[PDB]
Write a protein that binds this ligand. Structure first.
Ligand SMILES: [Zn+2]
Ligand SMILES: [Zn+2]
Ligand SMILES: [Zn+2]
Ligand SMILES: [Zn+2]
Ligand SMILES: [Zn+2]
Ligand SMILES: [Zn+2]
Ligand SMILES: [Zn+2]
Ligand SMILES: [Zn+2]
Ligand SMILES: [Zn+2]
Ligand SMILES: [Zn+2]
Ligand SMILES: [Zn+2]
Ligand SMILES: [Zn+2]
Lengths: 271, 271, 271, 271, 271, 271
């Protein structure tokens, strides 16, 4: 199992830029070509994101074309910036097991040593995350029927406050409902999130919980500053690889930079 | 508790640059000035690194002056690029609780909600890691006499393989001995490492185990390719904050970039 | 009184770039978000500029949206690149006291310790500036009724030759008419200009007269080279602050760059 | 008269960088080579700066070699970062008319339409400025015996507060004494300063008073915040040219940037 | 004779980017303004290229406008990415002696000491080059009627394999037909090519044969790696100048960079 | 045969930078590490350069260490910036076949399909080139006794004028004497040069004659202007590969840039 995990693409419509000056569409197209030019090729790509920025049809058309151009199976989930109906109309073809019901988009993947669970944490008319009871019970079923085989969950919103002044108020509001499932199921060992536009990580019993940086713009972590900052600090994504009995996630830079060069002992310490 | 955690500074001597072209001294001086310019100030700074590149006294002279100019208490531990004797001679004044015996540099910090444990995994005459009999025992003593209070360990070498073709053969060789301690002690919940020059992370039981990017050069993760690559992709460090009952870690970029701007609802989605 | 003073935006139509390669629209949107993310917030924003590049309706639509997104009262004036009618049709809403007559767009602001005077120096069918007699007499009235209270004037074209080979021929052709008002009114102490895409400054009796750099592209100052150069050297704007009895203007960079860091005496001079 | 006016070079010794990471020596060497490569060549170069950072002899050795390699007559004055004695020992050969007495370095230049006055506002053992009794008197002597010929003064410290939270408490403390001279002498019309590392400008009577950006690092203007910031925003200098009866000053960027291209009417507005 | 020789523009339609992220249209517009802002002005511009990327009408419209804005006579030839019919419909006006027949676009220029020959190496429905028999015989005629006067030929595809793993398979498939003409005609001394997006050069008897870098993206030379790489390494073009009896071609960078500065013997070797 | 051919390294001594601001030592160290990191490894590295800038022993010390760290056999020849005696003392251990006599450094390489000829065109006390009587004779001896086997010559100075206002008066003064050898010997087919810091190329008979860019700074080609310019436009080198019967040379960028990505038919032309 090799997974390329990106999120918060925030696509705009043809010939628009985010905020009028950040070319999300180009940046993402770069990321796509970057991903499908990797030497060690992932088995699938996950997008946990706010796939589009405003939830408009023209935005999903760009998203469909650019994400369509990836040369991998995709697993896609909505965010607060998404519109459930339109997400399903445009993207369901790229991720068929999302289903047929916009209000219950979720699915399980049983192809690898660790089962993958994809869920919708987004709620209409708010930025905050909400886990619906049908989501929770589907989860309970999945985790029970799965037994010992470990599980990871992908969702847009972080299930608990992370001390981020800007991001916490708009976290998953009833995140306790998932936290409780980690108490029930020792098998559930990873939860991965978007929304924070940051690599922030934590542990709750067996579960490693982490948010991801965005593919384009990032938001910094402030503890007592309320200001809605965002910046163009380096974009990054997460690779997930099954390494024997371990799930290992490593950051893979999406920035363009110098190198690589080879390490050489003489060049390292001249005499 | 706010911790600024950098690693793998790899200082060279006054004249010199890493490999002849990477100006580590400048980059670290920048990192230092960056750190002590933060609005939200950490309580201390951790450096888990190969503090110097060649284990030379003139490198420690530079490291002492530059790390010395941080306006924070420091916790410093060595790596395989360090020299036990010289590390102690030059850096012990900047971290007195390391002790007096260069072969058993260690200390516990008890000031915050989570106990901090600093150890030396470096072994003279090899790049690979080793936990000395006395270290393992001191580690187990800390957890045994510590009770419910959670513990995090800082060590240079990762205590398990991570699937990194380059970095795995030179991990901590008796790492399973520390993994044994996490199985036995439910209160050991973070292990943080240098060595890998990358953010790779995994959970074993309750423990979140993660390596850090370097302050300067990075090494990419390859599964198949053993070519000893390094590159100049973006440097970051890890901030550790206590958030009620959670230890949360977030990546703080040390690159220079555009931003920040403020998020504006109307600019985000114009009509 | 804090004023953010930018000019020569040179907006193009939706999905055009200036000269086909300079993205003025993105650059300006950046500037806007930059301005309305300032920590010390100005009382208003002045645009002395060639607001659009070709004087086309589609250009004013972009200008209206982007300048509209600023979170400040705006004071806007035309330039040679503008079209008076269309300027008034699209932008008058953002700056109501321009008036109702495209041929006599001007206004006074009596909110601060120094009265502000906004005038139209642009003339149809030419690049050169022209001050119409009705402009001059309105000015005389304003300056007389104002008495001792100091005044500053904002206009597109510099009232006198500045020794700039390219820019002088297309300066304000009858700039003597304003120069004469500075001789009459000791109260008139600042004149600020666009057009030159440069920070070039001078003094005439009590009056400090200066042109501003552009928000995007700049034109260098040459004394005997006729060539119509322009470059992408760093963009900048002017802040005007009333400091007791002084009007102080300082340059505020619009470039993205490294820092800031804090000055430290030990880091400054090590021992 | 063409003057190239740079300031605040802040040289460090041969090995070293400002604060450990800003390569002032390189940046100034670049600035120097840049200056003596200009197509339109200045008649002389003014340096109003803190020529060196720590007031050390080995810094003056560097400053001497680098400023020495300018192919222009130089006028150099000290700042609070300079050492009177050493400034004279090392730099007086590059500016002979400074004199022989390190406590009264001063000179008038009478070659152009405007008299040039160079003075030393620096005071041993403080960052703030001071005009010595003999300076003030020599200043008044120059203007008194000078008649109608206009005068400009070059000094390190600004002679009045400018609203800069950082830079104001360390302005020229008896600056009002020079302001007294501008009230009495209508021919004193420019005062130019270093210290602030910024282009801020104001008029007092006939005098245009302006500070300059540094050749390397800059300090931003804050009204409220006293945090001693500096940054690496774009460096520029000021060119001073006599244009008939006007002294005009224009900002010359020292950054490296794209351009120039030529303006083409058809490319500007395609059909 | 001064010739500015660019190729492989790869224009996209209005508001598209190559691969969704490389702004070929802006990059080329930059190149155009760059070319027609040269101090030493060429006599004509040659484009050997894949002028457009997909062969679509909307693409030729952008190409027509941007190349139209050059202030020089153009000599234009098709590539594999072009569509012969549409190329002739849109671009023939900018290069009238291409002719009237899309299937036989070629021409000779007898204005300079060396005669220039422009030919179509592109073949419909393939990437590979093909020289048609009518092309070859037109060439034979031209070379015979020309006698001693030297000749250079411009074509899209390189007439022989260059050892480039990616590019060789899609070279000019019957390139032997031209190689044979160089054996027959000692007068034929330069052959210049696009297609390879690289400066790769070779000699066959009297003939110097070279490919050109692209104006935007480049493809690296690999000898046994099949992967279809491309990169954004620096773009460049070729200048051809008749220097007495010699045809000299020099690379002229299209990248933006620092300098120039003037060489100075003292600055070079200080004492 | 794969050759990596760099030129004009211009090393300075340990402390120092070229002209005070260009860090040639770092740039060359980078180039070196870059070279010995190539996937397709050259059989040897040619350096035709002014290996050092001032002809100083401490510069050769640096050059020795840095060129010494290449993991390839080296062929080194001097330029006008070199010192014959010191070049031999310091670099002959890295290229033993240069000989023992500093006034007649030369050698033939016979290992590949094409004979390689390395010579010294540098002349003590001038920047211009000279072929010593014994050189010309040794050259003619090699070609005479060599038969059909093709030959390439590496020399610092270009053997004919190229129309470069700056570089022509300082070409190889008796260059016509080598041109005489190409007329007489049809097997002399490549001549490669440094000196010009540019890729300019021409053919004389069967010989392709080309100069190389420098590893660091470049000098632009002007026909009319003699101002001694240099700039920091992109550095590259030349790879020489034997491809059956063809010697092919391709430019390898040494800059750091975005890419590579893979070409995808569908991404190239979306529907
Ligand atoms: Zn979100
Ligand atoms: Zn988001
Ligand atoms: Zn290590
Ligand atoms: Zn390390
Ligand atoms: Zn204008
Ligand atoms: Zn303008
Ligand atoms: Zn100062
Ligand atoms: Zn200063
Ligand atoms: Zn092609
Ligand atoms: Zn092409
Ligand atoms: Zn040379
Ligand atoms: Zn050279």
């Amino acid at each position: 199992m090799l997974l390329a995990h990106i999120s918060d693409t925030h696509f705009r419509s043809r010939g628009e830029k985010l905020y009028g000056f950040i070319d999300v569409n180009a940046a993402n197209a770069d990321v796509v070509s970057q991903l499908n030019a990797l030497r060690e090729r992932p088995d699938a790509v996950v997008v946990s994101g706010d796939i589009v920025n405003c939830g408009r049809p023209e935005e999903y058309q760009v998203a469909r074309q650019i994400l369509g151009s990836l040369n991998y199976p995709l697993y896609l989930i909505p965010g607060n910036h998404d519109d459930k109906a339109l997400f399903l109309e445009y993207l369901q073809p790229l991720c068929p097991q999302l289903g047929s019901d916009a209000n219950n988009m979720r699915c399980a993947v049983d192809d690898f040593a660790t089962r993958l669970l994809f869920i919708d944490s987004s709620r209409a008319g708010t930025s905050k995350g909400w886990l619906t009871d049908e989501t929770i019970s589907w989860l309970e079923a999945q985790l029970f029927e799965g037994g010992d085989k470990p599980a990871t969950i992908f969702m847009h919103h972080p299930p608990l406050p992370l001390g981020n002044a800007q991001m916490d108020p708009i976290a998953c509001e009833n995140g306790h409902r998932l936290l409780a499932l980690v108490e029930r199921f020792p098998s559930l060992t990873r939860i991965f999130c978007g929304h924070n536009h940051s690599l922030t990580m934590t542990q709750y019993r067996q579960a490693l919980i982490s948010t991801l940086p965005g593919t384009v713009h990032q938001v910094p972590y402030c503890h007592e500053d309320t200001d809605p900052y965002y910046d163009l600090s380096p974009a990054s994504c997460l690779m997930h690889r099954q390494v024997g009995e371990q799930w290992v996630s490593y950051q893979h830079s999406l920035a363009h930079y110098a190198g690589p060069w080879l390490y050489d002992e003489n060049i390292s310490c001249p005499t």
